[PDB]
């Protein structure tokens, strides 16, 4: 399965999705800079509308514990 095919379900907790992401990211062998680009970009983009909304409110500069606690009720 390709990294672009990794997406969050409509009922799937973000948490279970983030695990899937760094597992597939774990099978990507690209430069770190590209993998940083993938992190800030693709993760949020394939996140579900309800959490996506939430993550837009965190702004930039956000870290994984704060994202992970931010989308917990969703």
């Amino acid at each position: 399965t390709s990294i672009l095919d990794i997406r969050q379900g409509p009922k799937e907790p973000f948490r279970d999705y983030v695990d899937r992401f760094y597992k597939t990211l774990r099978a990507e062998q690209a430069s770190q800079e590209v993998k940083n680009w993938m992190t800030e970009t693709l993760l949020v983009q394939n996140a579900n509308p309800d959490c996506k909304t939430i993550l837009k409110a965190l702004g930039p500069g956000a870290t994984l514990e704060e994202m992970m606690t931010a989308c917990q009720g969703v």
């Binding site: 983030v18 695990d19 992401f21 774990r26 870290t63 994984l64 992970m68 606690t69």
Partner: protein, 147 residues
Amino acid sequence: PIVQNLQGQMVHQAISPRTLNAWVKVVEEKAFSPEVIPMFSALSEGATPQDLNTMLNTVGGHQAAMQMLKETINEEAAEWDRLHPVHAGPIAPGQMREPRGSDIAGTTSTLQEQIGWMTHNPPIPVGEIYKRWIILGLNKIVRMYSP
């Protein structure tokens, strides 16, 4: 790990498969539970950075946590470099180089280098510095993964 031989010197010996598997099994069974930290601590007795990356890299599953830890290890390493600046002028022929955050993380150092620092007189406890970062990052995880 670096262990003491019968002759009375400190030499490196490899870690055992049923030790490896015991590390695996702990993680399988007790996931993020607090008992994991003393357990870790016992199984990390006399361990190298290199052996500590081996243990972290051999995890399967809990990849969100594994990434949070990595990022904590690099933060703690960035902080090592900040707090301890590089030293004045060129490195002496008679001496061996001071470690950076990445040597502590095992990344920029070789095994023989990791054995130089620990076995030499005075010895420097680069295991115990990484160990605190691991334990600190373990607290972060435990606190988050509380429900």
